[PDB]
RNA sequence: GGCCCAUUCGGGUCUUGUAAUUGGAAUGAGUACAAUGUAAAUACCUUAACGAGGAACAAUUGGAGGGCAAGUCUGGUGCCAGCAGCCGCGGUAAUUCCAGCUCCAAUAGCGUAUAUUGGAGUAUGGUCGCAAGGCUGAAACUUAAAGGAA
């Protein structure tokens, strides 16, 4: 039972580890794509209408 | 409908039918608005229940004509107007999450 | 003379009628273009009346009645200011003094419509702390997110709806209704990261001293002996007294078949008899819907950032996932609660 | 430390409790009837405190064991519908009158049903509350206020029921400007009789018309005889006279009831003469109408409101009114004489505290 | 869908039979109950005739 | 200091709320409950609508 | 006893809700439709 | 005709909600000009340049509010918001009248700027003027104009349409160029302010000077830990504050206190209109 | 198996479907070297070097139609009907789910509002007015002679 507990908590701290790697080391907090583009709530749209 | 104008400006007095139980009914979407240039009190449609959270008391709103194309089953005939903007920001953009209300 | 005595003082009837045989004493008394401009005219008239009256009053009584008018350089002396403010005073950080209206001194239950911010990534959780900036004050509190079951009650929600406003209730300093506010999860630069920080926005609808919030309670029972329209139900209750309080209640099946609790069986204790509108199955589950009150937690943690030496890295109550990761505990999971792919065979009959 | 605002004496008990309720500040009323034959609260005062607890919510009222100390920490005004049984010591008017102060500023509407004695000598009658006080509330902005007499009960057995409904939940009273003296358009009245012969109403009306025939204005006094179960238990009669201004809308009133062993014409002449006395002593409001107007201009928005009051109207109860208001709201009434040298009238200018109705739900 | 977000029309997934009750088989819903009840009513009507 | 003392009781309340947030739900705050999950004869003491 | 009290209260609440909703809808229909009909008469005149 | 219909529409645009100003016409307070930006944008140098242009005096150390007689009838209280404190941003967004919002032109928008914009929008919208700095770091002029237009469009999406995004070329002698500061000061002078609801209902005050009045002998007898008596000097905004003591105030970040003493003082930075067409150099004052 | 027509019954037709895999080629936006250009510079012309698989180098705007729950509300002559449903029971590193539900049209454009080229009879929880009810004498009186009914 405790081995299963160590396995699941290891998976959780691993996921938080990839999140800590994904966050940037640079001091400046840059705007992200969602705030930059401001697409809003949009439906799924076909690729054919792009061109 | 309005005197010589396509759109009118008003102050939201109250939201009628918020104590009604059925979501997205016309009674749920009715809003009473007092027009600025006359002081006349008219009922308008907020387009959705989602926009009814954005509409609040004593805000300025821009009203246009409603313009039904066909007779729906559950609509309220007689309400002739719809709310287009609130606090200078369009209700559709607020609903689609492209803007925030300035207050 | 008391004002409890509503009828005012009067003289004797004889002297009063002798004085009022004549009537000559009181014989003198008897005998815009737009609505917007009209409203502005009324406002301007009230303002100029205020100006004339304040002008004709003497300046000392003018100061007493009006108070210190805006634009006046003033010195204000406070007692009981904490030591840490003077000790750690930093001139770069501002000092803002705002007067409090009488409602804003009180503490009670604030009810407000509230939505998770668009640029905030995750949803918010019931009974999970949030720093609210309501009025002049910023304070960390525990809100409860509620819903109206089609305007019939206030039912507790486990999370805020994404992309939607929901009713929320929290304990804090009361404010005037129709007041907007923001809510931030973290105010510490050690915690900021790359994420957008503003978590919730909202507006106050109502204030009160208490609120009745309910959470749904489903009592779950199982059939062990089934007849036509009559079933014997087990595991819902533990004794015939518990059954006898709930006798006559609506129950229903996960299939959707409606029924009534009728009587308590003698043996064994928790079992009861029920009548349904149709024959039910041994695979069925019987549920009884009830409601249990939920109490709003009374937590008031003000953000006293100026009293700190760092003036950032303010800390408060942590988020539940943070506490779980800190004490190395696993997220509570129910094996029956997971969703699976359901395959149905073709339904045949004899 | 809550730091209670301390008052002394049993004087202005209802006024202090109501002003504490409106200002939200906790009060401590001490040494009430400390040395008397029967020290402590009166039963009607305890009933009034229970009425306040009924109409409000989250309010802590503490009474000492001796009864000489009352501790009151007010709460949110919530209103709602309830039934209040008045004791036999006081009529219904003693409990209805403080509710007019609290009524337009509640979360829900007042619909209160009062059961008890309807009329008495020393307190407000039903016609008094209907026609003297409620026009002032309507002038300050209360659009829908009503008082229905389901049953009428004369002293001492009582047995009447009156229903107070206030449908106008306003944010705050409007600023008032009544510098000019109103002119009276007409005089009306109601002469009522319960459980006694129905000739007494006509006899009272003739006795009052004897006094008021000299007036050029029209005098109309309605005959109100109560029959059946609506008449209550004990017999009585009485007349209420109101002089009304048609243009401005003000009303000045006097009233009385008949005690056991009195001639109706004497009561009619007494009420007519007291009415004329109130016109003589009154400039814009009656002396009995005055605390309504003063408290309303206090709780109005932060603007100067002007109300003309009379040289006779300034007296002792007005002084203690202004002192209690200054103690609670920190508001001083600046008194300005009218420039007209014909009549010594004084303009009362009150800056409103900026009170607002925070109990009402915006939604 | 004129004025409905696509997040309003999310799929609500079906719950399964409890593992302690797995011996009894599949957990019926309204769609299964309607088939069962319609079959019974057709059989009973022709038996009545 | 007074602020330091208030920080002490605030930390006490914070730690108590941390334990409350970590700890298991009450049987009534659990969504679906059986008699096995409940303590015995609880529904006689609690009032439910 | 509690069952009878709850049933009576819920029936009264449902009837009052239905009356209130019908009153609101009827008032809106009558006044607003009267204004709409006057405006349409003006437009067909012009 | 068409002109009449356009006139009706623009009259409908000119219609607005009537609302009480509660602003003293005789001696108005200075407008709070709040410089808000990410930590390296140039707020201190911008305040240096603006003060250098207005009061003809340079300040080596900038901290706390700065009161400056900008025009004949207008005074400005410059406050540089600390970039790393969200609580500071919340207080500034609650009290600020004009917000100079600094955007690094080369890097683009930042989360601090977006957070301050959303806080200001939800509490109450002040008049926002954007200032884009670090445009000299661009290597190509076409990329410079393209980034300029991109910043302008995103800024117009956030703030009301038509709000100015001023462009600053670069520092020459440790301060921004004089012509750019002259145009910026002209924009600040020509801006018009509207009253917000919360500031029209509550009295508030940004502290100009902070001092301690407690007795050192008392401190020596009862240790350092005792509460201190504190005097606060500043200009009053909002509604009039009551003359009698005991009025309850909240100090943002400290707590709730009741006023023990209050006195009016002569104005340290008086306007030349109250002193009495072109503004005089003797009239330009700094506090 | 796809598509077309048709009120249904049906009829007509024939390489179509796949959110399946996989291969190299092309190059514009851009990044950027120079010369040319001009009092000087910009711009233009010319122009090496880099420049694509989620081609995330991330096109919009509108319209039509579903479907789902141990969920919610309303009306009923069981199992229904209606309105609807971001809200379910647990859970937010928590879950990989109608795979992001399907289809249509315009396309760096695309919507909305306003302007402009009667007869006969039902329904009405709106407003207003009129109502309806009691043996009479007889109420503050259980109260007479007469009747009114019987
Ligand atoms: N190249 C260039 N540098 C600039 C410009 N504007 C500001 N700077 C830089 O900004 C630096 C000054 O920093 P500050 O004046 O303190 O700017 P700030 O945003 O207020 O930073 P803090 O006060 O520390 O929070 C100077 O050394 C300049 O190098 C600009 O337009 N171009």
DSSP of F1-49: -HHHHHHHHHHHHHHHHHHHHHSPPPTTTSSEE-TTTSPTTHHHHS---
Task: Check: CB of residue D26 under 8 Å from CB of residue D74.
Answer: yes
Task: Check: CB of residue E23 under 8 Å from CB of residue C222.
Answer: no
What is d(CA E30, CA E7) in angstroms, rounded to the nearest whole number?
25
- D154 closest CA partner among D79, D101, D233, D213: D233
Q: Are residues D46 and D157 in the same domain?
A: yes
Phi, psi angle pair for D240, to nearest 5°: -125, 125
Phi, psi angle pair for C221, to nearest 5°: -130, 170
* Nucleotide minimizing C1' to CA distance for residue E14: I69
Residue H44 marked in a binding site: yes
Residue closest to I59, CA→C1'? A50
Instruction: Work out whether strand D334-337 and strand D345-351 pair parallel, antiparallel, or are unpaired.
Output: antiparallel
* Residues 6 or more apart whose Cβ sits within 8 Å of residue C90: C311
Chains D and G touch (3+ CB pairs under 8 A): no
What is d(CA B24, CA B68) in angstroms, rounded to the nearest whole number?
17
SS3 of residue H226 by DSSP: coil
What torsion do the CA atoms of D252, D257, D261, D264 make, to the nearest 10 degrees?
Answer: 50
Read off the tokens for A33: 């794509």
- D135 closest CA partner among D293, D19, D277, D287: D293
Interface test with A, best of B98, B99, B100 (most A CBs within 10 A): B98
The secondary structure of chain G in percent helix, strand, coil, rounded to multiples of 5, reads 95, 0, 5
Q: How many CB atoms lie within 10 A of CB C186?
A: 20
Q: Of D239, D259, D276, which residue is a domain's last?
A: D276
The residue segments making up the domain with residue D39 are: 3-179+277-357
What is d(CA C273, CA C229) in angstroms, rounded to the nearest whole number?
11
- C140 closest CA partner among C199, C205, C207, C75: C199
**Ligand 1 in reach of H44 Cβ (< 6 A):** yes
Task: Check: CB of residue D137 under 8 Å from CB of residue D292.
Answer: yes
Q: Are residues D191 and D164 in the same domain?
A: no
What is d(CA C55, CA C62) in angstroms, rounded to the nearest whole number?
8
Q: Is C69 on the interface with D (CB under 8 A)?
A: no
- Counting one residue from chain B and one from chain D, the pairs whose CB atoms sit within 8 A come to 5
Q: How was this structure determined?
A: cryo-EM
Q: Are residues D127 and D207 in the same domain?
A: no
* Residues 6 or more apart whose Cβ sits within 8 Å of residue A42: B96
Q: How many CB atoms lie within 10 A of CB F6?
A: 15
Interface test with A, best of C191, C330, C335 (most A CBs within 10 A): C330
A49 CA vs I59 C1’ separation (Å)? 8
Interface of A with B in 20-39 (CB under 8 A): 38
Residue D89 inside a domain? The answer is: yes
What is d(CA E46, CA E44) in angstroms, rounded to the nearest whole number?
6
Q: Of D223, D244, D276, which residue is a domain's last?
A: D276
- H88 closest CA partner among H127, H47, H34: H34
A46 CA vs I61 C1’ separation (Å)? 13
- D54 closest CA partner among D186, D212, D164, D218: D164
Residue D91: how many CA atoms within 13 Å on its side-chain side?
Answer: 25
Q: Are residues D66 and D166 in the same domain?
A: yes
* Distance to chain G for B90, nearest Cα, Å: 25
- C102 closest CA partner among H241, B77, H248: H248
Q: Is B19 on the interface with G (CB under 8 A)?
A: yes
* Distance to chain H for D136, nearest Cα, Å: 26
Interface test with F, best of C89, C159, C220 (most F CBs within 10 A): C220
Q: Are residues D45 and D103 in the same domain?
A: yes
What is d(CA H163, CA H152) in angstroms, rounded to the nearest whole number?
9
- Give how far Cα C270 sits from Cα of C214, C244, F34, F41, F45, Å: 26, 10, 11, 10, 16
Q: Is H225 on the interface with F (CB under 8 A)?
A: yes
SS3 of residue C66 by DSSP: helix
Task: Check: CB of residue H253 under 8 Å from CB of residue H82.
Answer: no
Residue H103: how many CA atoms within 13 Å on its side-chain side?
Answer: 27
What is d(CA D267, CA D193) in angstroms, rounded to the nearest whole number?
13
Breaks (C-N over 2.5 A) in chain E follow: none
Q: E-strand spans in chain B?
A: 8-14, 30-35, 41-45, 60-65, 81-86, 89-90
Q: Are residues D233 and D309 in the same domain?
A: no
User: Structure resolution in Å?
Assistant: 3.0
Q: In CATH, what number is assigned to the domain containing residue D245?
A: 3.30.360.20
* Residues 6 or more apart whose Cβ sits within 8 Å of residue H209: H232, H233, H234
Please state the domain extents for chain B. 1-103
Q: In CATH, what number is assigned to the domain containing residue D10?
A: 3.65.10.20
From first CA to last CA, the distance across chain D in angstroms is 35
Task: Check: CB of residue C183 under 8 Å from CB of residue C131.
Answer: yes
- Give how far Cα C178 sits from Cα of A41, C201, D240, D363, H232, Å: 27, 13, 45, 8, 32
With residue H95 as reference, give the H or E element that holds it. helix H86-95
Residue D210 inside a domain? The answer is: yes
- D355 closest CA partner among D99, D174, D162: D174
Residue D155 inside a domain? The answer is: yes
Domain count of chain D? 2
Place of tokens 């909002």: H238
* Nucleotide minimizing C1' to CA distance for residue D197: I140
- D140 closest CA partner among D286, D293, D244: D293
Q: Which nucleotides of I are covered by protein (CB under 7 A)?
A: 30-32, 42-43, 56, 58-75, 78-80, 82-98, 100-107, 112-116, 124-127, 139-140
- Taking any CB pair shorter than 8 Å as contact, residues of chain F touching chain C are 1-4, 10, 13-14, 17-18, 21-22, 24, 28-29, 31-36, 38, 40-41, 43-44, 46, 48-49
What is d(CA D14, CA D297) in angstroms, rounded to the nearest whole number?
19
* Distance to chain D for C11, nearest Cα, Å: 9
How far, in Å, is the centroid of ligand 1 from the Cα of H89? Answer: 19
* Residues 6 or more apart whose Cβ sits within 8 Å of residue H10: none
What is d(CA H252, CA H91) in angstroms, rounded to the nearest whole number?
7
Task: Check: CB of residue D272 under 8 Å from CB of residue D211.
Answer: yes
Q: Measured from the CB, is C332 under 7 Å from any atom of strand I?
A: yes
What is d(CA B36, CA C38) in angstroms, rounded to the nearest whole number?
10
- D115 closest CA partner among D143, D136, D134, D96: D96
Q: Are residues D289 and D151 in the same domain?
A: yes
Q: Which of H45, H132, H151, H169 to mutate to test the pocket of ligand 1 (most atoms within 8 A of CB)?
A: H45
* Residues 6 or more apart whose Cβ sits within 8 Å of residue D26: D2, D3, D4, D5, D20, D71, D72, D73, D74
Instruction: Work out whether strand C272-276 and strand C230-234 pair parallel, antiparallel, or are unpaired.
Output: antiparallel
Chains F and B touch (3+ CB pairs under 8 A): no
How far, in Å, is the centroid of ligand 1 from the Cα of H131? Answer: 13
What is d(CA C312, CA C93) in angstroms, rounded to the nearest whole number?
11
As a three-state string, the secondary structure of chain D is CCCCEEEECCCCHHHHHHHHHHHCCCEEEECCCCCCCCCCCCHHHHHHHHHHHHHEECCEEEECCCCCEEEEECCEECCEEEEEECCCCCCCHHHHHHHHHHHHHCCCCEEEEEEECCCCCCCCCHHHHHHHHHHHHHHHCCCCEEEEEEECCECCCCCEEEEEEECCCCCCCCCCEECCCCCECEEEEEEEEECCCCCHHHHHHHHHHHHHCCCCCCEEEEEEEECHHHHCCECEEEEEEEEECCCCCCEEEEEEECCCCCCHHHHHHHHHHHHHHHHHHCCCCCCCCHHHHHHHHHHCCCCEEEEEEECCCCCHHHHHHHHHHHHHHCCCCEEEECCCCCCCEEEEEEECCCCCCCCCCCC
- The shortest CB-CB distance from A29 to any of H112, H154, H157 is to H112
DSSP secondary structure code for residue H240 in this structure: P
Q: Are residues D67 and D136 in the same domain?
A: yes
* Residues 6 or more apart whose Cβ sits within 8 Å of residue G23: none
With residue C145 as reference, give the H or E element that holds it. strand C144-147
- C306 closest CA partner among C87, C130, C16, C52: C87
Q: Which residues of F touch H225 (CB under 8 A)?
A: 1-2, 4
C284 CA vs I103 C1’ separation (Å)? 39
What is d(CA B12, CA B53) in angstroms, rounded to the nearest whole number?
13
Place of tokens 């002798």: C18
Q: Are residues D157 and D220 in the same domain?
A: no
What is d(CA H47, CA H184) in angstroms, rounded to the nearest whole number?
12
Would you list the DSSP string of A6-50? HHHHHHHHHHHHHHHHHS--SSS-B--HHHHH---S-----GGGT
Q: Is C197 on the interface with H (CB under 8 A)?
A: yes
Task: Check: CB of residue C126 under 8 Å from CB of residue C156.
Answer: yes
* Distance to chain C for A23, nearest Cα, Å: 6
Q: E-strand spans in H65-139?
A: 66-69, 75-80, 98-104, 127-133
Q: Which residues of E touch B48 (CB under 8 A)?
A: 3
- D12 closest CA partner among H141, C297, H71, C6: C6
Contact H242 D330 (CB under 8 A): yes
Place of tokens 């204005």: D217
Exposed/middle/buried for residue H209 (C-beta within 10 Å: 0-12, 13-18, 19+): middle
What is d(CA C233, CA C265) in angstroms, rounded to the nearest whole number?
9
What is d(CA C324, CA C319) in angstroms, rounded to the nearest whole number?
9
**Ligand 1 in reach of H90 Cβ (< 6 A):** no
Read off the tokens for H20: 């009480």
SS3 of residue H99 by DSSP: strand
Residue B3: how many CA atoms within 13 Å on its side-chain side?
Answer: 12
Q: Which of H171, H174, H175, H177 to mutate to test the pocket of ligand 1 (most atoms within 8 A of CB)?
A: H171
Phi, psi angle pair for D120, to nearest 5°: -155, 175
């Amino acid at each position: 039972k405790e081995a299963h507990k160590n396995a699941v908590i290891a998976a959780r701290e691993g996921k938080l580890a990839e999140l800590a790697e994904n966050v940037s080391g640079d001091g400046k907090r840059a705007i992200n794509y969602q705030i930059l583009k401001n697409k809003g709530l949009t439906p799924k749209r076909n690729k054919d209408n792009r061109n | 409908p309005f005197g010589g104008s396509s759109h009118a400006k008003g102050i939201v007095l109250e939201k009628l039918g918020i104590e009604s139980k059925q979501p997205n009914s016309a009674i749920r979407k009715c809003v009473r608005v007092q027009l600025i240039k006359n002081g006349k009190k008219v009922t308008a449609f907020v387009p959705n229940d989602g926009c009814l959270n954005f509409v609040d008391e004593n805000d300025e709103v821009l009203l246009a004509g409603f313009g039904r194309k066909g007779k729906a089953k559950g609509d309220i005939p007689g309400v002739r107007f719809k709310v287009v903007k609130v606090s200078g920001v369009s209700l559709l953009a607020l609903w689609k999450e492209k803007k925030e209300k300035p207050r | 003379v008391d004002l409890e005595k509503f009828v005012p003082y009067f003289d004797t009837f004889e002297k009063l009628a002798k004085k009022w045989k004549s009537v000559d004493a009181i014989k003198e008394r008897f005998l815009y273009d737009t609505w917007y401009e009209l409203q502005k005219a009324k406002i301007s008239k009230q303002l100029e009346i205020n100006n004339i009256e304040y002008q004709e009053m003497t300046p000392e009584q003018r100061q007493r009645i009006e108070g210190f008018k805006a634009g006046s350089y003033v010195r204000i002396v406070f007692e009981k200011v904490p030591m840490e403010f003077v000790k750690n005073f930093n001139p770069k950080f501002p000092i803002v003094m705002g007067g409090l209206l009488p409602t804003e001194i009180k503490f009670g239950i604030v009810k407000a419509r509230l939505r998770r911010h668009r640029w905030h990534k995750k949803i918010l959780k019931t009974n999970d702390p949030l720093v609210l900036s309501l009025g002049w004050r910023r304070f960390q509190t525990l809100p409860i997110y509620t819903t109206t079951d089609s305007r019939t009650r206030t039912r507790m929600l486990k999370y805020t709806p994404e992309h939607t406003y929901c009713n929320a209730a929290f304990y804090g300093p009361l404010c005037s209704p129709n007041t907007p506010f923001c809510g931030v999860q973290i105010v510490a630069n050690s915690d900021t990261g790359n994420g957008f920080r503003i978590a919730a926005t909202g507006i106050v609808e109502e204030i009160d001293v208490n609120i009745e919030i309910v959470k749904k309670l489903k009592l779950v029972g199982f059939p062990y002996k089934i007849f036509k329209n009559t079933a014997f139900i087990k595991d819902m209750f533990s004794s015939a007294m518990e059954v006898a309080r709930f006798e006559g209640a609506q129950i229903k099946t996960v299939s959707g078949i409606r029924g009534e609790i009728k009587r308590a069986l003698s043996k064994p204790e928790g079992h009861y008899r029920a009548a349904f509108e149709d024959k039910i199955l041994m695979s069925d589950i019987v549920i009884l819907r009830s409601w249990y009150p939920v109490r709003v937690k009374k937590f008031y943690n003000p953000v006293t950032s100026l009293l700190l030496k760092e003036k950032t890295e303010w800390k408060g109550l942590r988020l539940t996932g943070q506490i779980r990761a800190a004490m190395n505990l696993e997220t509570p999971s129910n094996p029956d609660s997971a969703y699976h792919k359901i395959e149905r065979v073709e339904r045949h009959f004899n | 430390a809550p730091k209670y605002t301390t008052f002394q004496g049993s004087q202005n008990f209802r006024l202090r409790i109501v002003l504490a309720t409106l200002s939200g500040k906790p009060i401590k009323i001490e040494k009430i009837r400390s040395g008397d034959l029967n020290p402590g609260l009166k039963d009607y005062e305890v009933s009034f405190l229970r009425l306040i607890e009924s109409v409000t919510n989250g309010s802590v009222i503490e009474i000492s064991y001796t009864g000489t100390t009352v501790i009151y920490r007010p709460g949110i005004i919530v209103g709602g519908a309830s039934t209040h049984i008045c004791p036999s010591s006081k009529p219904v008017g003693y409990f209805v009158e403080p509710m007019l102060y609290l009524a337009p500023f509640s979360k829900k509407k007042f619909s209160i049903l009062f059961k008890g004695i309807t009329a008495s000598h020393n307190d407000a009658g039903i016609e008094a509350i209907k026609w003297g006080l409620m026009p002032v509330m309507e002038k300050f902005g209360v659009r829908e206020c009503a008082l229905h007499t389901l049953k009428r009960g004369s002293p001492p057995l009582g047995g009447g029921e009156v229903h107070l409904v206030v449908d106008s939940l306003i944010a705050q009273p409007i600023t008032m400007h009544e510098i000019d003296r109103p002119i009276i358009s007409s005089i009306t009245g109601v002469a009522y009789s319960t459980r006694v012969s129905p000739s007494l109403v006509n006899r009272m009306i003739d006795g009052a018309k004897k006094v008021l025939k000299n007036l050029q204005c029209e005098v109309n006094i309605t005959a109100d005889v109560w029959r059946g179960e609506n008449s209550g238990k004990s017999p009585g009669w009485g007349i209420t006279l109101v002089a009304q201004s048609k243009q401005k809308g003000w009303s000045y009133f006097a009233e009385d009831i008949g005690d056991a062993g009195s001639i109706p014409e004497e009561l009619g002449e007494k009420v007519a003469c007291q009415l004329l006395e109130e016109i003589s002593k009154s400039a814009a409001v009656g002396r009995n109408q005055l605390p309504l107007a003063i408290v309303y201009m206090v709780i109005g928005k932060e603007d100067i409101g002007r109300l003309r009051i009379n040289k006779e109207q300034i007296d002792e109860r007005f002084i203690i009114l202004l002192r209690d208001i200054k103690k609670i709201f920190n508001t001083e009434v600046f008194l300005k004489p009218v420039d007209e040298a014909d009549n010594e009238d004084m303009i009362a200018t009150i800056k409103g505290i900026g009170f607002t109705n925070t109990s009402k739900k915006i939604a | 869908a004129k004025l409905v977000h696509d997040v309003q029309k999310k799929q609500h997934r079906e719950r399964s039979q409890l593992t302690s009750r797995s011996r009894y088989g599949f957990l019926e819903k309204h769609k299964d109950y309607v088939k069962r009840a319609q079959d019974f009513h057709r059989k009973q009507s022709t038996l009545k005739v | 200091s007074s602020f330091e003392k208030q920080q002490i009781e605030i930390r006490k309340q914070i730690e108590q709320l941390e334990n409350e947030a970590v700890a298991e739900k009450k049987w009534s705050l659990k969504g679906e409950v059986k008699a096995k999950d409940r303590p015995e004869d609880a529904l006689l003491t609690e009032e439910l609508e | 006893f509690e069952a009878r009290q709850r049933i009576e209260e819920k029936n009264k609440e449902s009837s009052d809700y239905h009356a209130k909703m019908a009153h609101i809808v009827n008032t809106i229909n009558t006044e607003e439709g009267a204004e709409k009909n006057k405006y349409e008469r003006e437009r067909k005149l012009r | 005709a068409r002109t009449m219909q356009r006139s009706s529409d623009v009259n409908e645009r000119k219609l607005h909600v009537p609302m009480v100003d509660r602003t003293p016409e005789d001696d108005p307070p200075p407008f709070i000009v709040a410089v808000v930006g990410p930590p390296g944008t140039g707020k201190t140098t911008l305040i240096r340049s603006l003060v250098r242009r207005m009061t003809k005096s340079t300040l080596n150390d900038i901290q706390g509010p700065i009161t400056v007689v900008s025009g004949k009838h207008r005074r400005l209280t410059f406050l540089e918001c600390p970039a790393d404190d969200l609580n500071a941003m919340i207080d500034i967004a609650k009290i600020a009248d004009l917000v100079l919002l600094l955007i690094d032109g080369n890097f683009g928008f930042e989360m601090e700027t977006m957070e301050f914009l959303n806080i200001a929008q939800h509490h109450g919208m002040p008049r926002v003027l954007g200032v884009a700095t670090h445009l000299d770091l661009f290597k190509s002029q076409s990329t410079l104009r393209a980034s300029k237009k991109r910043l302008k469009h995103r800024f117009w999406t956030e703030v009301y349409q038509g709000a100015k995004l001023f462009y600053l070329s670069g520092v020459i002698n440790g301060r921004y160029p004089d012509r750019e500061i002259l145009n910026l000061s002209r924009f600040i002078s020509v801006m018009k302010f509207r009253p917000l609801k919360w500031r029209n209902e509550h009295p508030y005050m940004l502290a100009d000077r902070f001092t301690d009045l407690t007795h050192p002998e008392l401190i020596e007898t009862q240790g350092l830990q005792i509460d201190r008596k504190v005097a606060i000097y500043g200009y009053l905004h909002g509604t009039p504050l009551p003359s009698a003591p005991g009025t309850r105030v909240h100090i943002a970040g400290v707590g709730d206190f009741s006023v023990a003493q209050i006195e009016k003082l002569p104005d340290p930075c008086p306007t030349p209109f109250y002193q009495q067409k072109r503004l005089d150099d003797k009239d330009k004052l700094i506090y």
